[PDB]
């Protein structure tokens, strides 16, 4: 199974940061055996975070992908599942996938939050944190935090959360339009 | 198709930073279905950018890989095509499966019709000599070139911002990235 | 397309300061000529379990040493008991070793040897907090210990001043490298 689960090529806004349809998430997940190879980028098109500066607060927001136990996207997700499907060479434009457990983050590697020091649960392991760059400009750093299975909303079985933000002080407003970020994670199966 | 398209892993000088073949670009592209997994590193061997310090300007340069509509490297590229080929000296005829998607990364009123300028770039620190106190940067850009009537392009911008009074070689740590494939 | 790993939820399996004082989670997945990797470290006891600006040095090394069949040597910081293919200890994993052509063991300007290409360097973030950067350095084939044929070394550290002590508990880090075969 070398398939890809992705945000579909429809050019419409597909995601909610603050309100419905205010952003365009690009996400591709490709199965490489027991690891998923991923690339993600975000463009906020309208609303509070479309153009940012130091007077905007807070300087972080969250995009949640919540999945049930078959790996299907739940309607409480920030991503509109209208735009979430397997990439295909055929015409699955109108056929939603039924199962994608092999694309879910492992709940053994990344367990949901729930005395021996050797039994201490890692707080870092379920997160991937890096700079991204607004407009792809080296002098416009922001950040991305990818989180695995840290959500409980909608009785989800699995979750992938993207927290986007920034810390550098910006006087002139700049679009929140991120460079693409590559990451990988251990798959459920 | 799980093949690799690369420079070979230990290339002779094959790339132009300032003058032809003044550097060694090691680049491997591995097809994982419709996403490409890539690793890149650059050693400048001669000329202006072989040994850098704060007196060198400008502190950024561009390496363009330009492809036709079959995914074949055009001779106007900074990278020499002589040993750019599949891992296996007959030149390849087709590599469209390794090109960056022009739907995901297209060439350059309604806010819902706004186009992302960030998504076709990957920006990160790299570290000269692999030392944590010698940061530089890399910018990978997909399909942003139009030279030589290219159908696809991958551009690497390398540079640095930190002040280096004691000179050091422009010799990058390896950088991993991925991108959505054309097919 | 197989995976070689520590298992995804390992018990203490790694030596930072003393044996089994830390939990290294490492998965290597073969994608043809490249290996795709994810790594994270939790130090659970000892000097580096809870770090601060008084701790020195602010860097330590975790060495994975392999013989010519890609089998982990006992001199490695990582214990080999649960280092195996995902589902008997494995007999061969040369396909998971970093290339000695891309990343030669240490030994005319057009014949200068790159010092950077065998290293991958990035920030990781302790507890996954954006305000707690540390760093990771991955090094290929740079060790000579135990007459190893291949090596992967992880140097972890930090530079930011932390006056309030915090666990050395890294965010996950993804990298890739050219495989030996
Ligand atoms: C002044 O400090 C920064 C900046 O502009 O904010 C820090 C930034 O790095 C981080 C991690 O934010 C860095 N970008 C990269 C990709 O290295 C730039 C860059 O080096 C110069 O702009 C080149 O002239 O310098
Ligand atoms: C002083 O600031 C820097 C530096 O040397 O320039 C910034 C640099 O980070 C960036 C993004 O350039 C950082 N390197 C990493 C990999 O984190 C080092 C490092 O923390 C110390 O050298 C350890 O002693 O510190
Ligand atoms: C003040 O400087 C730092 C910090 O806290 O040390 C630098 C750090 O980046 C590096 C390369 O270490 C950065 N983290 C990321 C992931 O970008 C944070 C962050 O932007 C703010 O904490 C948000 O409020 O700011």
Author numbering:
A (entry chain A): 179 to 292, 297 to 371
B (entry chain B): 179 to 266, 272 to 291, 297 to 371
C (entry chain C): 180 to 266, 273 to 292, 298 to 371
Published text:
The HAdV-D36 fiber knob domain (FK), which mediates the primary attachment of many HAdVs to host cells, has a significantly elongated DG loop that alters known binding interfaces for established adenovirus receptors such as the coxsackie- and adenovirus receptor (CAR) and CD46. Our data suggest that HAdV-D36 attaches to host cells using a versatile receptor pool comprising sialic acid-containing glycans and CAR. Sialic acids are recognized at the same binding site used by other HAdVs of species D such as HAdV-D37. Using glycan microarrays, we demonstrate that HAdV-D36 displays a binding preference for glycans containing a rare sialic acid variant, 4-O,5-N-diacetylneuraminic acid, over the more common 5-N-acetylneuraminic acid.
In contrast, 4-O-acetylated Neu5Ac is expressed in fewer species and has so far not been detected in humans. N313 is one of the residues of the conserved VSN stretch and closes the binding pocket from below. Interestingly, the O-acetyl function does not contribute any polar contact and instead induces the tilting movement under the steric influence of the bulky side chains of Y315 and P323. This interaction is supposedly not favorable for the binding; however, the steric constraints bring the O-acetyl groups of the three sugar moieties into a position in which they contact each other by means of a triangular hydrophobic interaction (mean distance between methyl C atoms: 4.3 Å) that displaces water molecules in the area. A similar effect is not expected for Neu5Ac. Interestingly, all known complex structures with 4,5-acetylated SA display a similar arrangement.
